[PDB]
RNA sequence: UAUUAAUCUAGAGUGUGGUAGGGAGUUUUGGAAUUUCAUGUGGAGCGGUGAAAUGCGUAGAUAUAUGAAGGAACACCAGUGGCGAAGGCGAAAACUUAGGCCAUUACUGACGCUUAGGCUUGAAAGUGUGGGGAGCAAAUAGGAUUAGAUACCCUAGUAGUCCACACCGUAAACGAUAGAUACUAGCUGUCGGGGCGAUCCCCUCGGUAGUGAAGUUAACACAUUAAGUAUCUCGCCUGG
RNA sequence: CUGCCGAUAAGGUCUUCAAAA
């Protein structure tokens, strides 16, 4: 799998914290792939936890077997320098198969390009953008669909026997009953 | 539910605070009397239907 | 002839056709399709001889592995059918076998009774003429 | 999860025969083996019990079928898989 | 006998001499209504108005109060029948 | 008066994925002034996304990134 | 039709490729809120009701601010919604795991439907052993009301509600509608997969709703998710 | 804007009819 830890180390001193993250990394993770690490920075988190108001957020983008979690998880709490820890397995988040699917990635790029074009015209440099068309409906249908529309599998069948056919065609329904008025 | 007075006028603060208190009073009164889980679900669906039907004709 | 829809049929072969005919009559539909079987093919041949349906064409696939019969009903000019009511006798489970002396007459001969004695499906009058009886498929009037 | 690819390749009578009865029973036995472990560990998951019972019953009916038709292959299949007992 | 200008939302059984036509356009209606009146006037031996006539004499105007809009809207005036309890 | 501009952004953008350290400032708009996940009428997202953002936002509120009851 | 000897894939399954889920169990984690206790400020009521009275309070209550401990349930999201065969499932994460939808130039080649007996699951209450107990509250005590009140109201309050392992197997366990299969106008929503590519909207294949004709019904009403036209199988009914 | 608020002996008529004007 591909996991993603977001570690919360205390707010002491930068250089010494990085060592704490490195120590916490090299101890656990029995079997592991490449361990890329980041550093989101220093933020004043919303609710105070462990009576601390500043914390260093680290992100790990390793990958490996399911056993890489147990030892690291049980040591995090014990370590007084770590406030929280979340192992978000990106193979189970709300949408992962589509993200690996190649066609959807290219379509998303195209949507980014086109959507950026619309927002630009609206927030025109200074000239008035009369259409202000964003939330409103679009124009006529997309001619792309009209053509590239799928064709159902019309299974072709060959006639073998017949009988009585004459295709009379009696498509004259709801015909007039009354015909010509008359007097007794 | 902090709302600043802006020190420009007083009424306006109470004009916004009335709304905030009404939605606040709804949940405060909900967790006052014990209903069964089925009845609690029943009351949630009842509120949603009332709000929905009213919004249909206001839209 | 080409199609677009998948064709399914019931496992019981007499009432499958019977349901198709009855539903089309009630809903005023004319052209229906179903899977083709030799018992089903033979009963449709005698029906068109008796003048209850207009045309009956059996077709096969391009591979010769499947056949589906697509029949149409015989509506008059004012759009009221020739079939009035259908009822199946030898249903699955309880198979009806009647000798010649007890061959039924449906609506005093107005309707037709389908009897497959020994030479395929056969009308009641000709069954009486040969003085031989057997399996009774369905009542059509 | 079980490595479905390896077990199917072992049970193939010939290539591309990925939908016979023999490949089905080899896969079913593997799922049964895995599910008995899981259910014995937990003992309170009853939907897994539902899956285990359904898979056992499905395997039994198919083997009955393979006895009714081509009984000789039934003897061959039973000695390799050791599923009877 | 009853004749009518059905407009796609009518039961064809009730009418006898159905005349497929519009019913929402103040121009189509008048053209067709005068046409039936025109038959009556010729039978009564008074001169026709629109029937058996060339282009210049059939010309009619669109009443007041791009193209004309024969769209049916005002759907918001159809809520759910008052219910709930 | 009101507006009809309520349309799921991630659909027009085809974002297809929500991660709490890729669009954090985007998720703060969905939250209420009193740190609450605004409903459909305010947030504007399709229910499917409305579910995805809620799980991610509650995850951030577990990760101690956004408050609970105050500003 | 039944038996036997064989062929075929359309029924049903398997694999590959897309894919949506509060589906389940096990182990950890989190914040509000209530209660109790600890420490400050404070000074006469608080509490409760139709109205009051038991009750709590100068031993400093209610209130306010901080902290600690502990148990239970998971606001908003949350729905003219999703999943499961049903009961049911809604804080976050990990592991294990069940079924389902769509497209299949692939494969087996009738292996399918139902199911007496049997097995599995099965809301809440209840039982047995050992833990746990913040809140609430059968039984119980008191104050009210009342002609009387063993009840509705109020103040206390044990079992219980919680966990682990063993049982009990009943509910308006309801869609008061057994399962499977084929056919029969239409319109409006909404959800998922697929096709196009800003959304929005169009088409296809399915799930979940509303309206509605033929058709059915004693009527109410059902109406493509049937209570309609038919077949198979099981269960059940025969006046109070 | 939610005080309080209980009971009521037995058996019984009444549609004769449309043949019709
Ligand atoms: Mg047959
Ligand atoms: Mg505290
Ligand atoms: Mg219980
Ligand atoms: Mg007492
Ligand atoms: Mg109390
Ligand atoms: Mg007890
Ligand atoms: Mg019962
Ligand atoms: Mg209805
Ligand atoms: Mg009796
Ligand atoms: Mg009184
Ligand atoms: Zn969306």
From Swiss-Prot, chain A:
Q: Which domain of life is it from?
A: Bacteria
Organism annotation? Mycoplasma pneumoniae (strain ATCC 29342 / M129 / Subtype 1)
Q: Which HAMAP family match?
A: Ribosomal_bS6
What is the recorded function of this protein according to its Swiss-Prot or TrEMBL entry?
Binds together with bS18 to 16S ribosomal RNA.
Q: Where is this region: Disordered?
A: 121-153
Q: What GO biological process terms does the UniProt entry carry, in alphabetical order?
A: translation
Keywords of the record: Ribonucleoprotein, Ribosomal protein, RNA-binding, rRNA-binding
- Keyword field contains RNA-binding: yes
GO cellular component assignments: ribonucleoprotein complex; ribosome
The protein's name in its UniProt record: Small ribosomal subunit protein bS6
The entry's family comment says: Belongs to the bacterial ribosomal protein bS6 family.
This protein's gene is called rpsF
The opening ranks of the lineage are:
Bacteria, Bacillati, Mycoplasmatota, Mycoplasmoidales, Mycoplasmoidaceae
Basic and acidic residues composition-biased segments: 144-153
Which PROSITE patterns does this one have? RIBOSOMAL_S6
UniProtKB/Swiss-Prot annotation, chain C:
Q: Which GO terms describe its biological process?
A: translation
Query: Which parts form a coiled-coil structure per UniProt?
Result: none
Which Pfam families does its entry note?
A: Ribosomal_S8
Its function, per the record, reads: One of the primary rRNA binding proteins, it binds directly to 16S rRNA central domain where it helps coordinate assembly of the platform of the 30S subunit.
**Which family does the UniProt entry place this protein in?**
Belongs to the universal ribosomal protein uS8 family.
Q: Which organism is it from?
A: Mycoplasma pneumoniae (strain ATCC 29342 / M129 / Subtype 1)
**Gene Ontology CC annotation, any one:** ribosome
Starting at the broadest rank, the lineage of the source organism is: Bacteria, Bacillati, Mycoplasmatota, Mycoplasmoidales, Mycoplasmoidaceae
Q: How does it assemble?
A: Part of the 30S ribosomal subunit. Contacts proteins S5 and S12.
Q: Which UniProt keywords apply?
A: Ribonucleoprotein, Ribosomal protein, RNA-binding, rRNA-binding
Q: Which InterPro entries match?
A: Ribosomal_uS8, Ribosomal_uS8_CS, Ribosomal_uS8_sf
Under NCBIfam families, the record lists:
PRK00136.1 (NF001109)
Name listed for the protein in its UniProt record: Small ribosomal subunit protein uS8
Q: Which GO terms describe its molecular function?
A: rRNA binding; structural constituent of ribosome
UniProtKB/Swiss-Prot annotation, chain E:
At the top level of its lineage, which domain of life is listed? Answer: Bacteria
Which family, according to the similarity comment? Belongs to the universal ribosomal protein uS2 family.
Its protein name is Small ribosomal subunit protein uS2
**Record lineage:** Bacteria, Bacillati, Mycoplasmatota, Mycoplasmoidales, Mycoplasmoidaceae
Name of encoding gene: rpsB
From Swiss-Prot, chain F:
Source taxon at top rank: Bacteria
Task: Spell out the family assignment given in the record's similarity comment.
Answer: Belongs to the bacterial ribosomal protein bS18 family.
Task: Identify the keywords attached in UniProt to this record, alphabetized.
Answer: Ribonucleoprotein, Ribosomal protein, RNA-binding, rRNA-binding
According to the record's subunit comment, the protein's assembly and interactions are: Part of the 30S ribosomal subunit. Forms a tight heterodimer with protein bS6.
Disulfides per UniProt: none
Q: What is this protein called?
A: Small ribosomal subunit protein bS18
Q: What does this protein do?
A: Binds as a heterodimer with protein bS6 to the central domain of the 16S rRNA, where it helps stabilize the platform of the 30S subunit.
Which Gene Ontology terms describe the biological processes this protein takes part in? translation
Q: What does the entry list under GO cellular component? A: cytosolic small ribosomal subunit
Q: What is an example of a GO molecular function annotated in this UniProt entry?
A: structural constituent of ribosome
């Amino acid at each position: 799998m591909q996991y993603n830890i977001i570690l919360l180390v205390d707010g002491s001193l930068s250089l010494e914290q990085a060592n704490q993250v490195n120590e916490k990394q090299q101890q656990t993770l029995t079997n592991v792939e490449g361990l890329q690490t980041e550093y989101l920075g220093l933020k004043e988190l919303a609710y105070p936890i462990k009576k601390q108001l500043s914390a260093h957020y680290y992100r790990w983008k390793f990958s490996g077997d399911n056993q890489s979690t147990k030892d690291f998880k049980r040591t995090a709490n014990i370590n007084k320098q770590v406030l929280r820890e979340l192992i978000i397995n990106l193979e189970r988040e709300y949408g992962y198969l589509a993200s690996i699917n190649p066609k959807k990635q290219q379509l998303a790029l195209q949507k980014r390009a086109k959507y950026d074009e619309i927002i630009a015209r609206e927030n025109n440099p200074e000239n008035p953008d009369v259409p202000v068309t964003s939330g409103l409906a679009s124009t006529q249908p997309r001619l792309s669909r009209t053509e590239k529309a799928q064709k159902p599998k019309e299974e072709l069948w060959d006639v073998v026997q017949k009988m009585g056919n004459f295709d009379s065609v009696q498509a004259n329904p709801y015909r007039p009953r009354f015909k010509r008025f008359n007097a007794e | 539910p902090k709302i600043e007075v802006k020190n420009d006028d007083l009424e306006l603060a109470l004009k916004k605070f009335k709304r905030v208190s009404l939605e606040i009073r709804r949940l405060a009164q909900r967790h006052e009397y014990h209903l069964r889980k089925g009845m609690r679900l029943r009351e949630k669906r009842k509120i949603a239907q009332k709000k929905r039907r009213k919004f249909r004709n206001m839209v | 002839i080409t199609t677009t829809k998948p064709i399914k049929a019931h496992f019981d072969p007499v009432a499958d056709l019977l349901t198709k005919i009855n539903n089309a009559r009630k809903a005023k539909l004319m052209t229906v399709t179903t899977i083709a079987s030799k018992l089903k093919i033979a009963i449709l041949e005698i029906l068109v001889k008796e003048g209850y349906l207009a045309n009956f064409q059996v077709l096969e696939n391009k591979s010769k592995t499947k056949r589906i019969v697509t029949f149409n009903l015989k509506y008059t000019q004012r759009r009221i059918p020739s079939i009035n009511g259908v009822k199946q006798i030898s249903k699955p489970g309880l198979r009806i076998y009647r000798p010649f002396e007890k061959l039924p007459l449906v609506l005093n001969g107005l309707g037709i009774a389908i009897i497959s004695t020994s030479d395929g499906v056969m009308t009641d009058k000709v069954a009486r003429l040969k003085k031989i009886g057997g399996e009774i498929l369905a009542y059509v009037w | 999860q079980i490595d479905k690819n390896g077990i199917i390749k072992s049970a193939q009578l010939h290539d591309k025969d990925v939908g016979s009865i023999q490949v089905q029973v080899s896969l079913l036995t593997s799922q049964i083996k895995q599910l008995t472990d899981h259910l014995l560990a937990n003992k309170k998951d009853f939907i897994s019990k539902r899956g285990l019972y359904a898979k056992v019953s499905k395997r039994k009916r198919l083997l009955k079928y393979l006895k009714h038709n081509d009984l000789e292959a039934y003897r061959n299949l039973v000695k390799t898989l050791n599923l009877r007992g | 006998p009853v004749v009518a200008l059905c407009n796609t939302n009518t039961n064809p059984e009730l009418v006898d001499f159905i005349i497929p036509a519009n019913n929402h356009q103040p121009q189509s209606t008048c053209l067709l209504m005068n046409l039936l009146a025109d038959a009556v006037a010729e039978a009564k031996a008074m001169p026709t108005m629109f029937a058996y006539k060339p282009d210049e004499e059939i010309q009619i105007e669109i009443p007041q109060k791009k193209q004309i809009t024969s769209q049916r809207l005002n759907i918001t005036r159809n809520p759910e029948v008052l219910t709930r309890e | 008066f009101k507006r009809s501009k309520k349309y799921c952004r991630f659909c027009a953008i085809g974002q297809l994925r929500i991660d709490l350290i890729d669009d954090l400032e985007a998720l703060k708009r969905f939250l209420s002034p009193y740190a609450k996940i605004n409903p459909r009428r305010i947030t504007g997202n399709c229910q499917m996304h409305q579910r995805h953002v809620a799980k991610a936002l509650k995850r951030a509120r577990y990760l101690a990134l956004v408050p609970f009851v105050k500003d």
